[PDB]
């Protein structure tokens, strides 16, 4: 359901992701982010379905991260993932 | 299996469309040939048969590569028009068309190379030489910015 995941604003320690989806039918999202590869740990937090942006902070400068978005719907979704280096 | 050939087919369509674009061809042929370099290890993996099954980490890296090809696919049709390129060349500073897509493919390639060699035990070869992708983009953008201004 969610598509077009991009980093629309970025600082060396914080990011702002955005995606396109039919937010009217989406209950909430699960945002996961962590260092790419090597079985690195990941952190999770929830975002209400009405919005289409999320803020990730506390990141390390110059690290390739993996950001995945899990859309969940209650009225009626495969996740999307990208990579960004701060 | 089906997802492996879909990404290969999508990569071959991208290269064919880059050869057909008329404006800023040096940056276009650079993008399509970089896509060919990334799908070639996937083609060799396809040549092995039904014995090679990608894992979750490899499938996740291929899906990120597939989403980047669909991003590049939209930029190809967008930059197939003369006014859309002139709107970008007169508003941008570096005048590099696909600088956002080229950077996304560079990160996913090193993630595919590590997984194709360690998990699938597949030998891979480097993409290109000469210079870095950053310097190659600036040299192609300046050459395209010169020929595009000569069009009447
Ligand atoms: Zn993107
Ligand atoms: Zn070619
Ligand atoms: Zn013009
Ligand atoms: Zn990465």
Curated annotation (Swiss-Prot), chain B:
Residues 55-84 form a coiled coil. It comes from the Eukaryota. The modification Phosphoserine is found at residue 125. The record marks 86 as: Target of necrosulfonamide inhibitor. Residues 5-149 are annotated as: N-terminal bundle and brace (NBB). Phosphorylation by RIPK3 induces a conformational switch that is required for necroptosis. It also induces homotrimerization and localization to the plasma membrane. It is found in: Cytoplasm; Cell membrane; Nucleus. Upon phosphorylation by RIPK3, undergoes an active conformation. The coiled coil region 2 is responsible for homotrimerization. Belongs to the protein kinase superfamily. Homooligomer. Homotrimer; forms homotrimers on necroptosis induction. Upon TNF-induced necrosis, forms in complex with PGAM5, RIPK1 and RIPK3. Within this complex, may play a role in the proper targeting of RIPK1-RIPK3 to its downstream effector PGAM5. Interacts with RIPK3; the interaction is direct and promotes its phosphorylation and subsequent activation. Pseudokinase that plays a key role in TNF-induced necroptosis, a programmed cell death process. Does not have protein kinase activity. Activated following phosphorylation by RIPK3, leading to homotrimerization, localization to the plasma membrane and execution of programmed necrosis characterized by calcium influx and plasma membrane damage. Interaction with RIPK3 is species specific: human MLKL only interacts with human RIPK3 and not mouse RIPK3. This is Mixed lineage kinase domain-like protein. The lineage of its organism: Eukaryota, Metazoa, Chordata, Craniata, Vertebrata. The gene is MLKL.
